């Protein structure tokens, strides 16, 4: 066995939905400047 | 169940998740709804 621990912080996120409803892609606003371009 | 509206009601091919109960378009309208008694999926459209 093994485990992974991560922490959450306040962020804005962009979400894409599939043909039929299920989340297939995400974009994080604060990752890098290209992502800021994509979000704006 | 507290969601009140008026219009034409038909069936739909969408399949809500068990926790999913309503659907919202960009106009924040109610597009589709799951019936409490038959758990089916229904499409809503306006008339005027
Ligand atoms: C829509 O649902 C079908 C199975 O019911 C699935 O095969 C399909 O992947 C979904 N549409 C897309 C674009 O993935």
Swiss-Prot record, chain A:
Q: Where is this region: Putative superantigen?
A: 18-39
> Carbohydrate attachment sites?
20
Per the UniProt entry, the disulfide pairs are: 29-39
What is the protein's known function? Attaches the virion to the cell membrane by interacting with host receptor, initiating the infection. The major receptor is host ACE2. When S2/S2' has been cleaved, binding to the receptor triggers direct fusion at the cell membrane. When S2/S2' has not been cleaved, binding to the receptor results in internalization of the virus by endocytosis using host TFRC and GRM2 and leading to fusion of the virion membrane with the host endosomal membrane. Alternatively, may use NRP1/NRP2 and integrin as entry receptors.
Subunit architecture: Binds to host ACE2. RBD also interacts with the N-linked glycan on 'Asn-90' of ACE2. Cleavage of S generates a polybasic C-terminal sequence on S1 that binds to host Neuropilin-1 (NRP1) and Neuropilin-2 (NRP2) receptors. Interacts with host integrin alpha-5/beta-1 (ITGA5:ITGB1) and with ACE2 in complex with integrin alpha-5/beta-1 (ITGA5:ITGB1). May interact via cytoplasmic c-terminus with M protein. May interact (via N-terminus) with host bilirubin and biliverdin, thereby preventing antibody binding to the SARS-CoV-2 spike NTD via an allosteric mechanism.
Q: What is this protein called?
A: Spike protein S1
Q: Which gene encodes it?
A: S
